[PDB]
Design an enzyme around this catalytic site. Structure first.
Site, short mmCIF file in Angstrom:
data_model
loop_
_atom_site.label_atom_id
_atom_site.label_comp_id
_atom_site.label_asym_id
_atom_site.label_seq_id
_atom_site.Cartn_x
_atom_site.Cartn_y
_atom_site.Cartn_z
N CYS A 8 0.81 -1.22 0.00
CA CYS A 8 0.00 0.00 0.00
C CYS A 8 0.85 1.28 0.00
CB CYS A 8 -0.93 -0.01 1.19
SG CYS A 8 -1.94 1.43 1.27
N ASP A 23 0.22 3.96 1.56
CA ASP A 23 0.27 4.37 2.98
C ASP A 23 1.43 3.77 3.71
OD1 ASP A 23 -2.32 5.53 3.18
OD2 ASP A 23 -3.12 3.50 3.42
N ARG A 75 4.33 2.54 5.66
CA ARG A 75 5.55 3.31 5.88
C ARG A 75 6.77 2.42 6.08
NH1 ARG A 75 2.30 7.96 6.59
NH2 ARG A 75 1.14 7.60 4.64
N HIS A 82 -2.06 -3.84 5.54
CA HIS A 82 -1.67 -3.42 6.88
C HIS A 82 -2.87 -2.82 7.60
CE1 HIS A 82 -1.27 1.05 6.00
NE2 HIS A 82 -1.60 0.50 4.85
N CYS A 86 -5.15 1.33 7.78
CA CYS A 86 -4.88 1.70 6.39
C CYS A 86 -5.81 2.83 5.95
CB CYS A 86 -5.11 0.49 5.49
SG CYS A 86 -4.90 0.84 3.73
ZN LIG Z 1 -2.71 1.54 3.46
#
Ligand SMILES: [Zn+2]
Ligand SMILES: [Zn+2]
Ligand SMILES: [Zn+2]
Ligand SMILES: [Zn+2]
Lengths: 186, 182, 182, 186
Positions: free
Chosen positions: D8, D10, D12, D64, D67
């Site tokens: 994703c 997002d 990290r 994850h 999200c």
């Molecule tokens: Zn995400």
């Protein structure tokens, strides 16, 4: 079906008229400004299906004069999502900006329409699908036409390709012929 | 033009003859099995241009019986790239797997062609493009049609939407009407 | 996050190490040869979400030397579906065919990796998403980078844009600077 | 590279951390909510390249918890273009609406995250690319993981497929296991 026809969503004349073929012989895709974008899943899957599964031997890309999509590409207003679709047309404009600049303003749209078709046949002939079909000796011809909405007649243009080599020659020649200007300039 | 018509690439009837309207009234998109896939830039930009720029107030999605796209989606042969496009139709088959199962194999296709149209209108109605036009009071109606040429006839496939409310209702109802079997 | 980073799928350096920023600051997209293709719904929706929803004010496009995507685009073997994606890079090669021709064959790739980044930033800047944000006074800067690991270094690839004006200027200038040959 | 990682935008934590692999071993695609949309040219071309050209034998889809893409899919506000991308997630929500309805409201997001991964592996295994690779006896495993951002640990999930048949079994089992609820309901 023996013909795949890629036309514009504007175009009001059905492919039946412009090909003189009976209903049943045409498989038809229509999008704004009759594009074959390299990475358009919609149009590419249509072409792969026509060529690999239906064994269609002719693909016709047909543009037309007085095309709203072409006009909209040129006006370059903030139309929203469609602007992104039409950015491929503005790339073609600027690839031919010196040529287009020699025309009178009111002649430039219809020149862009013709250039567009040539460029879209060139894209089609470079797809993995068409290149592979040619490589394995499959019979497949590509045709780029423009229909004149004013006088209801076709203009074959002369973009015709039956192999990767004739694609190069045909594409180059088409652009060279478009570059020879009549009374379109002052 | 006043109408956007979304139809199938293997359809053999022109939109002009179906609608019996002027050459001029119809803005036309055609793809395999007349889909409105959420993330298809081609169809979505047609829709956005039609709704936001041409200010069209009617969108027709038109399916048909004996559709080679629906048949391909069902045969599930290794056809290549096109199979990826048609997986959206397989998702539709599975969503209605119970309904389609309790039906004769030679009749499933035509049921699936009709269910498909209801699903694509529902998708059309859920686009940011159409949602937002309805939210700002814009006049816009969606119609799902199937035509059949055993003879020559149409059916506004029970699916008509002028708002998100009428989209839920018309969608659920269209599915329920299709679920009653001849 | 404050940055959108668009990088390459075959890049071997994480964006966090390049930027030397917190895990948290970077929203990340990766695709083959770090492209912003006009009509790619995947990248475009990342961009729209980043710009319009996350209110990110910096977009970095990061290319790299020894890029397998750029090399594939140049080899032009029958690789299959991926060749269609990479035709956008071939269009870029042809657009700069004269420049790239007057250069040693073993040096063309790395020139093309840099030209590619300038072209993708130019594409990013011409999206409806970014054009319209600049039109409404929104704070937003685009950066084209190339990193090289013969040793370990970067270059804000002469391409920096904060407006459409500075996009034209920075694009043309970046091309002109690349056209001076070592 | 021996691993294709689909994560994703997002997320990290780099795939290096979540796989423990050295830089160089991972080929990475990242998009909003780690989707394999059937007709996404971007992700599909990545997968075709990884499988057919690079001969990668492992594809990992990793979602994850917490999200933003999942949360944004659920909040269903007028976010603009991204809403269309996230409509594939809402389809998955409603495909599992009875299950999701039995959970406490604040548990539903993280259940959708897990369901999403399972559904995306199922999509990946049905691509023409993966199905063909399997048909011709190519060695290829698909993995669906979810990373817990709260406690910095993975959850293998157990979506693992090495063939079309184990894809069905694995996908079905994953959904069945997700349907057995702990203390997530009242
Ligand atoms: Zn995400
Ligand atoms: Zn037109
Ligand atoms: Zn059909
Ligand atoms: Zn690379």
């Amino acid at each position: 079906p023996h013909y795949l026809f890629i036309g514009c969503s504007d175009s009001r004349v059905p492919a039946e008229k412009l090909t003189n073929l009976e209903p049943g012989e045409l498989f038809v895709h229509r999008n704004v400004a009759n594009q074959v974008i390299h990475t358009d899943f919609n149009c590419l899957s249509v072409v792969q299906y026509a060529v690999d599964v239906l064994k269609i031997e002719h693909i016709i890309i047909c543009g037309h004069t007085n095309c709203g999509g072409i006009h909209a590409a040129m006006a370059d207003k903030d139309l929203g999502l469609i602007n992104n679709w039409l950015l491929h047309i503005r790339d073609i404009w600027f690839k031919h900006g010196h040529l287009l600049g020699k025309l009178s303003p009111e002649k430039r749209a219809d020149m862009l329409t013709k250039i567009n078709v040539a460029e879209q046949v060139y894209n089609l002939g470079r797809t993995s699908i068409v290149k592979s079909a040619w490589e394995r000796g499959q019979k497949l011809s590509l045709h780029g036409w423009v229909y004149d909405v004013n006088d209801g007649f076709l203009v074959d243009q002369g973009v015709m390709a039956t192999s990767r080599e004739t694609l190069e020659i045909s594409y180059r020649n088409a652009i060279a012929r478009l570059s020879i200007l009549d009374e379109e300039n002052i």
